[PDB]
Symmetry: none
Subunit: 56 residues, 3 copies
DNA sequence: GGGGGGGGGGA
DNA sequence: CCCCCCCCCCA
């Protein structure tokens, strides 16, 4: 799960737990894919949205 | 083809065209889906990276 | 790629293959976006036709 | 495995 | 809407 910028590990980590509770999902191997994936989906969606903001 | 932040359309377009040149691919109907697709993959990668950077 | 109705996956899959054959198009990354796209166009066309028929 | 963000098409 | 891609991230 390496990132482009490892120094951001802390950042995403916060946003991760944030989105988790929002959708009400428990990031664990005992959970479905559509559940663990929905999180990573929102994370990417937000990172993109922010980047598009600092360019508009 | 609505973007998350349509106000960035012009910025992402210039990014698209510049990446196409750097990649040597000529965007178009007659281009392979792989070549066209690669430009879109770079946009997301760079946007995600820039987000992580200017954040964490 | 998640279709409106995932359960239709198998059916659209067969229609796709049958359309590819009629068109003489080989679906793939190295195939032009136009050739690949042509197939998706027929699929939507036939689906809309079926819906208009079984609707009166 | 999944979700999301982009690229190029066709109907 | 469907087709073919590429990328990011979660697990």
């Amino acid at each position: 799960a390496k990132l482009l910028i490892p120094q951001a590990a802390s950042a995403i980590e916060q946003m991760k737990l944030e989105i988790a509770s929002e959708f009400g999902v428990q990031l664990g191997a005992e959970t479905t894919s559509r559940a663990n994936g929905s999180v990573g989906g929102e994370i990417t969606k937000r990172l993109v949205r922010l980047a598009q903001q600092n360019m508009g």
